[PDB]
Amino acid sequence: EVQLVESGGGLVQPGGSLRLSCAASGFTFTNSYIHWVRQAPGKGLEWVGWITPYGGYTNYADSVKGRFTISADTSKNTAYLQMNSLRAEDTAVYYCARGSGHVNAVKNYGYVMDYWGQGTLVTVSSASTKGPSVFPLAPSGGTAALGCLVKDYFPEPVTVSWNSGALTSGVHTFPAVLQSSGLYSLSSVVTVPSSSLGTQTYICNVNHKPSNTKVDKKVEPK
Amino acid sequence: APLLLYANRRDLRLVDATNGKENATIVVGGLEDAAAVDFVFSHGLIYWSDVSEEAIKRTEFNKTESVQNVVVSGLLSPDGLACDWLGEKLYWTDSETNRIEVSNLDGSLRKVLFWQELDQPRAIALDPSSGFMYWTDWGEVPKIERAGMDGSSRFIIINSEIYWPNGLTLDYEEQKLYWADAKLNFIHKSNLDGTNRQAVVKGSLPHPFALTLFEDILYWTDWSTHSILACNKYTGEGLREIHSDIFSPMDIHAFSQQRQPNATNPCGIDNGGCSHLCLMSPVKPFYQCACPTGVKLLENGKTCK
Amino acid sequence: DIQMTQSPSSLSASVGDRVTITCRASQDVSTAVAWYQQKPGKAPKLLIYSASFLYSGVPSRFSGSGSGTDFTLTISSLQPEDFATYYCQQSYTTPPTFGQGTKVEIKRTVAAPSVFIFPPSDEQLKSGTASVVCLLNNFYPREAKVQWKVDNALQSGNSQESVTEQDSKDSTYSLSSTLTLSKADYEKHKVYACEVTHQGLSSPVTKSFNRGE
Ligand SMILES: [Ca+2]
């Protein structure tokens, strides 16, 4: 099947540069449009530009023309977004997406984006990378609740699983919130039968890749 | 320098190659997805394909809007179209039904000429006085082919150094074939049987779609640059942009009676004695009787069952 | 550029409801319009293109119509998993442009939150800071008032909330409120209370603890 995998997202200082990559597989790279589209936190979708890898022709949004460029290495089936003179407003998740149909077809669906990568987060900020602290939230109606507090990290994102993925039901991992310090915080919680508190082990697994922080916290009562 | 007739998706336009800086005139407006275009100069007719309506239409020049539908069924992607101004016939390619067909100018008596070994047929050009038709196919096995205008004797003339042969045209005065390859980034020319091949233009063709010619000059549309370009047909020199900022340029012709050279219709006044179709043929007496699709031509070679 | 304008920017409808989202183009774009569905934390997914052509694998309840400047997305029978932001886009010309999006929420019966409070951990206390967490679990509608009281004094300015996205299964929300004090202020006081007002509750529920018990 068609696959698009973005990489190269990360924390970058204002005025700096960053190159994103989009590795494609499962379709003929040179028969397609490849698009970049971005989405700022809580905002809409903004088309950044496209490339047709067969010859490397591109189009760009007025908003980034002069600062961003797109290229493609057909031998690697990979497209790149070169971002220069970065601004705080460039902070966003960047997606690469494939246009539909064949670049040479008369009935053209090249601007219909039928396959999208998972996206890569770009954060333009002067702040430094910081790994989270993880604290337990120690455990009515026949059900108990427990969780982990993942405090003071930067930049996004962080991942939380419970019992290495074995526990999924009743789990709520909240969207991170930006604290007045400029660092993120969030909690992950799960509700379980209160009768279980004595015998069942509950571990929350926290990953902050930007800092390469990996923590497993056991959460015990009370 | 001639007027250039081109399709532009929402309309068909005419631009004076001698003044490509002025606004193009809209010959026909209110179209949905006009792709292919051609004309019958002596008849004052302009034909086009619309790939969203899945139709071929026509109008009378400067007596519009007397537009008519001429082919309305059995089309999906009619990407190419040519008018036989001599035999009075309409030819077209369909890249989705995988077919080359012919009909009368009014759409009657339709006959499927080829329906096998077609993948992405596109451009089609006619040499009515020689009884040959020429087409490109940008599919899995890309090629340029020719056959009789009666559907006889199909043969591949180019099948190497080819990838996306989009544009195709003929020089009637010099007996030369020209084509544009949108993937390989060139325009080439050859004898009509494909021999004596030569490069003309070797760069600045990021996405040529359709190609035409008038006197010493080639003209073509480019999908990437949204413009019409021109160069010298002998040397490939004098590459220049004729007309710019085109919404979506498509098929194109030098719009002139001189691009449809007069000759005697070998069918004569009486349709060559054919009950239905009288098609140009490369072999003497240079016409061939034919019948709408499914119906057989009888022993006498003139009357359909 | 062609401006794509969606309306409404958000809506709430019940399971089984017929939902209509409009998209208007500033220019005639023929039928060159696509619709996408975006679930939180995920990439958009194509639902429809060419205005009315249903993309392979997309549920039949989704349909698109329209031509020229006026386009419509219809969900014939809204399902809980349809919680998302929906975007129209013109695929007619460069630059491709998107509508601002329409947030679709599922309307269901009222459900009171289950409330839980968590004292700061001894571990965090060491560090010199105290986070107190109040959890509102599995409620609807989303509107809730959560107030902190420290020795019965209503707090302001020192807490922050976060709300999950609507549950794809039961269409409920959960919410966390975190109160942050310095460790020294935390030790100045005894009773830590989270008080919750919600439509599903006849009167506000309080969950409290006394520091050190
Ligand atoms: Ca085909």
DSSP letter string, B38-68: EEEGGGTEEEEEETTTTEEEEEETTS-S--E
- Is A57's Cβ below 8 Å from some Cβ in B? yes
Is the domain of B123 the same as that of B221? yes
First to last CA, chain B: 49
In this structure, are residues B29 and B22 in contact, taking their beta carbons and an 8 Å threshold?
no
B47 contacts B81 by C-beta, under 8 angstroms: yes
CA distances from C124 to B166, B175, C71, C93, C120 (A): 69, 89, 54, 55, 7
CB contact under 8 A, B248 and C31: no
Main-chain phi, psi angles of A116, to 5 degrees:
-125, 145
Residues of C whose CB is below 8 A from B10: 28, 30
- Counting every residue written for chain A, the total comes to 222
Resolution of this structure in Å: 1.9
Q: Which domains does chain C have, with CATH numbers?
A: 1-108 (2.60.40.10), 109-213 (2.60.40.10)
> What does the alpha-carbon distance between residue C78 and residue C13 come to, in Å, rounded to a whole number?
8
Q: Residue B298 sits in a domain of what CATH number?
A: 2.10.25.10
Whether residue B239 is found in the same domain as residue B287: no
Please return the burial class of B140, using the count of CB atoms within 10 Å of its CB with bins 0-12, 13-18 and 19+: exposed
Looking at the structure, do residues B34 and B180 belong to the same domain, yes or no? yes
Q: Is the domain of B255 the same as that of B266?
A: no
Tell me which amino acid residue B42 is: S
Give the separation between CA B201 and CA B186, rounded to whole angstroms: 5
- 3-class state of residue B198 by DSSP: strand
Interface of B with A in 69-98 (CB under 8 A): 77, 79, 95
E strand or H helix at C186, and its extent?
A: helix C183-186
CB neighbour class for C112 (10 Å; exposed up to 12, middle 13-18, buried from 19): middle
> Can you say whether residue B198 is alpha, beta or left, with left for phi > 0 and alpha for psi between -120 and 50 degrees?
beta
For chain C, the straight-line distance linking the first and the last C-alpha, in angstroms and rounded, comes to 64
Question: Which string of DSSP letters, residue by residue, matches C28-89?
Answer: --TT-EEEEEE-TTS--EEEEETTTEEPTT--TTEEEEEETTEEEEEESS--GGG-EEEEEE
Q: Using CB atoms within 10 A of its CB, is residue A123 exposed (0-12), middle (13-18) or buried (19+)?
A: buried
Q: Are residues B285 and B165 in the same domain?
A: no
> Are C74 and C66 within 8 A, CB to CB?
no
Sheet holding B55-60, edge to edge: B34-40, B45-50, B55-60, B68-71
Within an 8 Å CB–CB cutoff, is residue B76 touching chain C? no
Pair B232, B289 in one domain: no
Cβ C121–A138 below 8 Å, yes or no? yes
Distance of CA C112 to the CA centre of its chain: 17
The three-class DSSP label of residue C157 is coil
Mutate to test the interface with A, among C6, C116, C168 (most CBs of A within 10 A): C116
Do residue B6 and residue B71 come from a single domain?
Answer: yes
Residue appearing with tokens 């969900």: C75
What's the CA gap between A56 and A33, in Å, rounded? 10
Helices (H), C72-182: 122-127
Do B71 and B55 contact (CB within 8 A), yes or no?
yes
Q: Is the peptide bond before A155 cis (omega within 30 degrees of 0)?
A: yes
Asked whether A36 and A45 are in contact (CB, 8 A), the reply is no
CATH of the domain at B85: 2.120.10.30
d(CA C114, CA C108): 17
Name chain C contacts of B32, Cβ cutoff 8 Å. 30
| Chain C CB within 8 Å of residue B53 CB | no
> Does the beta-carbon distance from B182 to A106 stay under 8 Å?
no
Q: May I ask the CATH class of domain A1-126?
A: mainly beta
Domain boundaries, chain A: 1-126, 127-222
Q: Is B287 helix (H, G, I), strand (E, B) or coil?
A: strand
Give the number of C-alpha atoms closer than 13 A to the C-alpha of residue A154, restricted to the C-beta side. 18
Please tell me the distance between residue B119's alpha carbon and the centre of ligand 1 in angstroms: 4
Alpha carbon distance, N-terminus to C-terminus of chain A: 49
Q: How far is C165 from C42, CA to CA, in rounded Å?
A: 12
Q: Could you tell me if B45 and B255 are in contact, meaning their C-beta atoms sit under 8 angstroms apart?
A: no
Q: Are residues B115 and B264 in the same domain?
A: no
Question: Helix or strand or coil: residue C122?
Answer: helix
* Residues B182, B298 share a domain: no
Which among C49, C89, C162 has CB closest to A174?
C162
Q: Kindly give the pairing relationship between strand C173-182 and strand B132-137.
A: unpaired
Is the CB of residue C27 less than 8 Å away from at least one CB of chain B? Answer: no
Architecture of the domain defined by A127-222: Sandwich (2.60)
Domain that holds residue B36: 1-259
Nearest CB to A116; choose among C43, C90, C174: C43
Q: Are the beta carbons of B134 and B178 closer than 8 angstroms?
A: no
- Residue recorded with tokens 């080439």: B188
Count of domains observed in chain B: 2
Question: Mind spelling out the 3-state secondary structure of chain A?
Answer: CCEEEEECCCEECCCCCEEEEEEEECCCHHHCCEEEEEECCCCCCEEEEEEECCCCEEEECCCCCCCEEEEEEHHHCEEEEEECCCCHHHCEEEEEEEECCCCCCCCCCCCCEEEECCCEEEEECCCCCECCEEEEECCCCCEEEEEEEEEEEECCCCEEEEHHHCECCCEEECCCEECCCCCEEEEEEEEEEHHHCCCCCCEEEEEEHHHCEEEEEECCCC
DSSP class of residue B293?
T
